[PDB]
Paper text:
The HBV Cp is a 183-residue, homodimeric protein. Cp assembles into icosahedral 90-dimer T = 3 capsids and 120-dimer T = 4 capsids. Putative Cp allosteric effectors (e.g. heteraryldihydropyrmidines or HAPs) have been discovered that have antiviral effect. These small molecules ostensibly act by inducing an assembly-active state and by stabilizing Cp-Cp interactions by filling a pocket at the interdimer interface between dimers of the quasi-sixfold.
To examine HAP-bound capsids, we reconstructed T = 4 and T = 3 Cp150-HAP-TAMRA capsids to 4.0 Å and 3.7 Å resolution, respectively, from a single dataset. The resolution was sufficient to position and rebuild molecular models of protein and HAP-TAMRA. These structures are, to our knowledge, the first instance of using cryo-EM to visualize a drug bound to a virus capsid and to show that T = 3 capsids bind CpAMs. Besides the difference in diameter and the differing number of component Cp dimers, the local difference in T = 4 and T = 3 architecture is that quasi-sixfold vertices have twofold and threefold symmetry, respectively. A T = 4 quasi-sixfold has two repeats (B, C, D, B’, C’, and D’) subunits and in T = 3 there are three repeats (B, C, B’, C’, B’', and C’'). In T = 4 capsids, quasi-sixfold hexamers have four HAP-TAMRA molecules, while the T = 3 quasi-sixfold hexamers accommodate three HAP-TAMRA molecules. In the T = 3 particles, HAPs are in B pockets capped by C subunits. The pocket of the T = 3 C subunit is occluded by the neighboring B subunit, resembling the interaction of the T = 4 D subunit with its neighboring B subunit. Despite the quaternary differences between T = 3 and T = 4 capsids, the local environment of the HAP-TAMRA in the HAP pocket was remarkably similar. Long range differences in quaternary structure were apparent when overlaying entire hexamers, for example overlaying T = 3 and T = 4 quasi-sixfold hexamers based on one set of AB dimers. The next subunit around the quasi-sixfold, the D subunit (T = 4) or C subunit (T = 3), show pronounced differences while the dimer on the far side of quasi-sixfold is completely misaligned.
Numbering used by the authors:
A (entry chain A), B (entry chain B), C (entry chain C), D (entry chain C), E (entry chain B), F (entry chain A): 1 to 144
The structure:
Amino acid sequence: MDIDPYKEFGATVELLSFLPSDFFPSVRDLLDTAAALYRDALESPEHASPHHTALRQAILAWGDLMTLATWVGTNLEDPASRDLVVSYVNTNVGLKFRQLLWFHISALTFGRETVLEYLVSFGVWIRTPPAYRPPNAPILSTLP
Amino acid sequence: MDIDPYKEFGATVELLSFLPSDFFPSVRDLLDTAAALYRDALESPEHASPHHTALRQAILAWGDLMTLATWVGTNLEDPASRDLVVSYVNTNVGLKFRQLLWFHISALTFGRETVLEYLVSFGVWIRTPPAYRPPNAPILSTLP
Amino acid sequence: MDIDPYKEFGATVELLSFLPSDFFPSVRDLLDTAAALYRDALESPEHASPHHTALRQAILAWGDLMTLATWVGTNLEDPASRDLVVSYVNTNVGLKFRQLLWFHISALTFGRETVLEYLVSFGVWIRTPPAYRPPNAPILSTLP
Amino acid sequence: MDIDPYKEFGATVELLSFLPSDFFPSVRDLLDTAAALYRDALESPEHASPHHTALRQAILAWGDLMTLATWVGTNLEDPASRDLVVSYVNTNVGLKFRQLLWFHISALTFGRETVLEYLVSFGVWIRTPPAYRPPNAPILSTLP
Amino acid sequence: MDIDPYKEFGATVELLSFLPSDFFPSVRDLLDTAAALYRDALESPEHASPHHTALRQAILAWGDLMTLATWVGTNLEDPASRDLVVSYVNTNVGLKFRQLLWFHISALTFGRETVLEYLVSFGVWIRTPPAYRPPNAPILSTLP
Amino acid sequence: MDIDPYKEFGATVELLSFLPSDFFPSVRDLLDTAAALYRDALESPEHASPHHTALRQAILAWGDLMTLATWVGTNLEDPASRDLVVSYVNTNVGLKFRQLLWFHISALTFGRETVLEYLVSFGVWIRTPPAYRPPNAPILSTLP
Ligand SMILES: COC(=O)c1c(CN2CCN(C(=O)CCCNC(=O)c3ccc(C(=O)[O-])c(-c4c5ccc(=[N+](C)C)cc-5oc5cc(N(C)C)ccc45)c3)CC2)nc(-c2ccccn2)nc1-c1ccc(F)cc1Cl
Ligand SMILES: COC(=O)c1c(CN2CCN(C(=O)CCCNC(=O)c3ccc(C(=O)[O-])c(-c4c5ccc(=[N+](C)C)cc-5oc5cc(N(C)C)ccc45)c3)CC2)nc(-c2ccccn2)nc1-c1ccc(F)cc1Cl
């Protein structure tokens, strides 16, 4: 009854379990990137590619929790209520789809195959013990 | 980037603003009806429609929000501090994509064309004042 | 100078007066119809039909009457005289204006043929004795 | 909703603002131009061009603003406030309106080509330094 | 690297040194005239001419300098310390490309050929002493 | 009424918002590079490519502020006047188009596509948290 968010794009939630938590950027940094690079294509009413379809949805989803953050910021009285709730959204639910923002943005910019190869390559990096890991962790980059 | 998802689908948020709040079925019925008859290619690796890709991102979001309601209802202290939040999810944020689930499901069984005419042909039914309104709203259905 | 705003379109004020006054939708409830359905076609720099060129003028004409209901609506010294006039805009100009928007916005969605026939149809249905008539009122609809 | 009343006609408010304000003729002095030249073409039940359909609306739009300047023009209790508003019609609506009539009534007599070129021409001629320019101002004319 | 921009355009800075300081129109009129009739492809992603690319870099520079005048006039303390700077911008640095805007705009409507002849045919008009000078400078214009 | 300085070259001011302030070299270092590599082509009166057209303009623009720096350095008396002004030009207005100098120089040397790919690649570098950023930030380099 539960769908894999990435089963349609080749990747999977288990595969994204490689990437540690702190690896992912903040939601602001990702939203600014899409709104900087793709803002002229996201708002365009065309199916340029499935990531746009997913990316338009993921943005509005976080746009919705911002509402619940603001509603809770004012219509609640207890500090442990008004804070621990909003602390939950940024902490856990925010992390719940910084993957989606990080994934689909990185997929559009770099192609799906380059992202999937990136995950496996990053998987090998993290597996190796600290003594032999090359300190420069692998990082995405285009290729002509 | 401030844009509704209903752009490449030929719609708006104003277009689906005519529909009264009691128009849309419950969230449970929509989720069930999704898996009742779309569970075939909905939870598969296949890609088939652009509606499916947008759909899958909606069902995961509600599963996210329900994780929020379960969290707040069990850990936040005061019901006067949390039942506001719990009822807020089921009431307002739920109705956010309480209709989003409705659009894609209705579009899939019927088509982006037939759903739009039902929306166009509904507002004309609802914009009409009560005294001169037919006693039976138009029925969404496929035309052979 | 008796410039009928409908003589170009195979109609006339007498037919639109032939229907009952209260049948017509409200101004606010009707602007969003084109604003939600035709916001892209109207704002386009190339007209698609004379209804576009005509409806594109009615929207601007209503602009100042709201502005005049806003400038005068908030920049007077006597509130005892503000609603004396500001009420007149929604009183006896909208009645001559809500008819105008309804014609074109219905003319676009259903063609000038069906609207002109509907005016004859509905205007009769309200005249026939109630003992002898189909109680299901006649209405436009995109479906046959 | 930024419905330029000129974007359909290869112009825009900035060009018509590019000319000086006082260049435009008066409303009364301009209505008779179409009323004397185009009283037959406008009142015809078949439009001859989109300028007809557009100019046919501006005349009626000015109708109520005179009526509103007549209803309010004579049906108030405070003359101290009558000219406070009635002056505004000829104050800051005609300025946005005398431009509108001038464009179409000139567009019909001389085609949309010559008017759009004249706006560029005259708007420049008033900008060039007086020491270096033909003092004979540029003007439309039916003769070559 | 010490070179004027008027090289690939077939000109110099000496050639445009004949023109008196009062020759060129104001900076406001040039900026308006740029957007009055070139705003079509001036603020677009298109590349069309080599004049447009040089132009766009001029309009941004003046917007830069005006940001300087606004800054100094509001933050620098003494008018005897700042009005020198403010008037210096509008007077001297303004006239630097007060003519630069004039050359490209005049070149676009007319062509690199026709503008040069007007410059060649102007100096002969201005180098001539006053007693034998025709009372009307040559007029820039296109030749069919 | 405002043009994007980079809208014609594919990039945009938002895209260049990735690069932090201190990343950009000084104006002297860039001018020496162009005057070292391109001084034999900039002064050539030919449109070798649009960056030359932009690059000739950007140089003279900074060449103009050097004049205002020198004029202010001598014809002003107050130290907070003569210093804070010139401090403004080097600090803010200098930074305002060290981008243009850095961009167009890097575009000529490395091709437009390589620069645009560089920005996106640098964008991904800066987004990543410090713990996982490869310490060697990405840097331009040719490719046969
Ligand atoms: C996937 O869709 C859904 O699940 C769904 C649907 C749509 N479907 C399909 C339609 N539907 C039906 O129940 C239809 C069966 C009944 N059939 C009929 O009555 C029927 C059957 C045959 C004929 C027929 O051939 O003559 C006619 C018929 C005509 C047919 C053609 C025609 N011409 C143009 C020539 C003229 C006709 O003139 C008529 C005139 C009549 N007079 C005299 C009054 C009477 C009948 C007719 C009607 C409901 C379900 N709607 C809604 C919804 C929501 C809010 C508000 C309203 N609706 N929500 C959902 C949803 C819910 C939960 C969930 F979790 C997920 C979803 Cl998505
Ligand atoms: C885009 O350009 C501009 O905006 C612009 C222009 C140029 N334009 C176009 C020309 N212009 C006019 O006003 C022309 C209309 C008047 N037409 C006429 O007088 C006219 C029209 C028809 C004929 C005609 O067919 O016979 C003739 C004519 C002749 C024609 C052909 C001919 N042969 C070779 C066979 C012999 C002719 O012998 C004559 C002899 C005469 N006698 C007896 C004295 C009298 C007339 C004629 C003249 C001004 C605008 N200049 C200037 C400028 C600046 C500084 C100093 C001077 N000028 N600044 C700008 C600028 C300003 C602000 C801004 F923000 C941006 C810009 Cl860029």
